[PDB]
A and B are shown apart, each in its own frame.
Chain A
C-alpha cells in the first residue's frame, strides 16, 4: 500500500512459499489459515515448548536487491505466555532470533547454519497474546528491523526458535523510495536511499524539453522516502510560459521573445496573431517592423510625403524647403533623401539621371534637417528634385508610393515686383484687396503673399497670408487705424519683391 517497493511478501507468493526448514519434521510447519477478506497466506507455526533443548531454522527463497542499499523487514507474529501454559519455566520462551546471509548464487541448494549473520532477538511489543481462554482476539503486534549496507547480488532470511510458541503471520521485505517529482520547472527521477538512516542522496535532475537551465537543479533523497527543499531554479525557454509546473506554449494571440520570469504578452497594436507557441507576433500586410527594433514595439507604417515645398534659386546654386510629414506611422526616426532627376529639360517623361558630381552642403541622403542646399548646378538647364521621406522601417517596408517633387530652372530669374494694388471693399471690420500679376514673371506663378502692419502706431508683427488667387480679405480688425500692405509673387524660381505701400485706414 505504501510508496516503498516490495521485494518479498507472504500474500504476493504464487501458491506455496516453499521454505527450507531444519529440522523438517518437528520444526517450522506451513499451517495456512485464511485472513479476511479472501486473502490466502502461508503461515509458519512452531510450538515445541515441552521438549528441553530447542533449535529451529526457516530459510526464505532468493531475494534480489534490484539496486537497493538498505532493506527494511516487517514481521507479523503471534506469541503465547509461558506462565499461562502448563510446564517448567525456561523450557518455554517469548523471544526469537533473526538471521540474514548475502549471496550471489541464484538457486543455492544449501546455505550453512554457521554462515548466517544475526540481527536481533525479537519479542512481541507492546502487548502479547497469552492467549485469553474466555474469548479469542487477534494480535496487533508488527516488528520492524533494518539491514544495510549490502555488497553482494542478493540475500536470504532465516528465523530461529529457542523453545517458544510462535506463529509468523506475514513477512514484508521492502526498501525505502524517493518519488518522481517535477519541482522548479525541472524533472527529478525516482532514487534509492543511502546505506544508512542518516545518509542522503544528491539528485541532479534534468530540465523539461521546452526549457533552459539557468541554475543547476538539485535535491536530497531522505532515508524516510521523501524529497528535500530544492537547490537551483530552471526557467522555460523563449516562446514558452512558466505555468502548471511543466513548460506550456503561448496561446493564439500571445508571444514571448526572451527567456524571462514574465508570462506570454499579448500581440502589440496592428500585429497579426500567429500559431500556438510564438516567439514574436508577425506584422500583417501594409505594416512592418525593423530588424534592429525591439519585439515589444508595435507594427509601424511607412511615412507620407511632406505636403508643402518651397524653392529658391541662385546664380549657380539652389535651396529647397519643406515641413514635417502627415502620417509618421509610429517611428520617430525620420530622415530626408534628395534625388536628382534632370527630367525638367524636355517635354517627354523619358530622361537621363544626374550622373555628374552634384555636391550638397548639409547632406547627400538621410538628412535629419528640414532644409537642404545644392552647391553646384549647370546653367541654362532645367532640373527636377524629389524629396524622399525615409523612415527607419521604410527599407523593410515596400518603397513609398509617392514623394513630393518640384521642377525648377537654374538660369531663370526670380519674379519682379507687382505693378499696382487696389482695395475694393473697405469697412469698419473688413478690408478687401485686389492686385495684378508682375510684369516679368520668369516662370508660372504659384503663390501670392500679403503683408499686414500698423501705420502711425508702434511696430507691430507683420502678418503674412498665403493665397493662390489674386483676391483676398481680412477678418478681425480694429476701427480708425492706418494699415500698409505689400503683395509678393512666388514662383518655382524663387523669392519675389514687395509691392506698392498701400496706406488704407479703416471705416
Chain B
C-alpha cells in the first residue's frame, strides 16, 4: 500500500535512471531527504529542491514554466531521523492547492541541487497510476 523512496545519489535505483513505481488509487508515497550525522562538515552533504514536472521537463531536467515547487531538503540534521514528505494518490483533494491523481496516467518528479548539476543530468522519478481494472 505504502511506497518508500530514499532520495539520494548513493541509492542504486536512482543511478540507473529508469527508476519507476507502479501505484494504485488512494496509495501513499514517502520521500526521504539524505540524512547525515553531526561529524559530516556539510561539504559532502546533498541538498535538493523537488519539482512536479511534465514529460518535457522529465527529459530536459527543467522546471521553469513546466512544473511547480513541491518539497525542499534544506536541513539534513533533522532530530527524528531523515525528513519525511507524504503524498496521497487520491482522486479528489479537499485542499485548494492539493494535487489530484487520475487512473491510467503518468506523473513526473525532478530535483535540482542548491550548491550544482549544471543542467547535465538530474535525479528523476517516474510515477504511473494503475487503472481501476488493475487495482482490484
Contacts and interface: CB of A to CB of B under 8 A. Distances in A.
A79 B94 contact: yes
Contacts of A169: 95
Interface size class of chain B, counting residues whose CB lies under 8 Å from the partner chain: 10 to 19
B97 A80 contact: no
Interface string A82-102: 000100000000000000000
Q: Which 5 residue pairs are nearest across A and B when measured between Cβ atoms?
A: A167-B94, A167-B95, A165-B94, A45-B94, A47-B94
Interface stretch (B57-65, B84-92, B109-117): B84-92
A24 interface: no
A427 interface: no
A131 B96 contact: yes
Given A15-B80, A136-B97, A167-B98, A29 B88 contact: yes
Given A15-B80, A32-B86, A136 B94 contact: no
A210 interface: no
A273 interface: no
B93 interface: yes
A77 to B, nearest CB: 9
A34 B94 CA distance: 15
A413 B40 CA distance: 128
23 contacts: A15-B80, A29-B88, A31-B86, A31-B88, A31-B95, A33-B97, A33-B98, A34-B71, A45-B94, A47-B92, A47-B93, A78-B94, A78-B96, A79-B94, A80-B92, A129-B96, A136-B97, A138-B96, A139-B96, A165-B92, A165-B94, A167-B94, A167-B95
Given A15-B80, A31-B86, A32-B86, A85 B94 contact: no
A43 interface: yes
Nearest to A45: B94
A49 B92 contact: yes
Contacts of A49: 92
Contact of A138 (B71, B94, B97): B97
Nearest to B100: A131
Nearest to B86: A31
Contacts of A166: 94
Contacts of B96: 78, 129, 131, 136-139, 167
- The majority secondary structure among interface residues of chain B is loop
A85 B92 contact: yes
Interface string B68-94: 000100000000100000101010111
Nearest to B85: A32
Contacts of A122: none
A17 to B, nearest CB: 14
A31 B30 CA distance: 12
A55 B94 CA distance: 17
Contacts of B93: 45, 47, 167
Contacts of A445: none
B95 A33 contact: yes
Interface string A335-357: 00000000000000000000000
A318 B95 CA distance: 121
A80 B94 contact: yes
A504 interface: no
Nearest to A87: B92
A47 B89 CA distance: 13
Contacts of B95: 31, 33, 43, 45, 78, 167, 169
A169 B71 CA distance: 18
A42 to B, nearest CB: 11
Nearest to B90: A47
A200 interface: no
A166 B92 CA distance: 11
A165 B96 CA distance: 11
A157 interface: no
Contacts of B90: 47
Given A45-B93, A46-B94, A47-B90, 13 more contacts: A31-B86, A31-B98, A32-B86, A33-B98, A43-B95, A45-B95, A80-B92, A129-B96, A137-B96, A138-B96, A165-B92, A167-B94, A167-B95
A283 B96 CA distance: 82
With most chain A CB atoms within 10 A of its CB, the pick from B80, B88, B94, B96 is B94
A75 to B, nearest CB: 14
Interface string A15-57: 1000000000000010111100000000101110100000000
A165 B80 CA distance: 32
A185 B136 CA distance: 78
Interface in A165-183: 165-167, 169
Contacts of B80: 15
Interface in A103-146: 129, 131, 136-139
Contacts of A33: 95, 97-98
Contacts of B92: 47, 49, 80, 85, 165
Contacts of A47: 90, 92-94
B52 to A, nearest CB: 13
A16 to B, nearest CB: 9
- The winner among B88, B95, B98 for most chain A CB atoms within 10 A is B95
B30 to A, nearest CB: 12
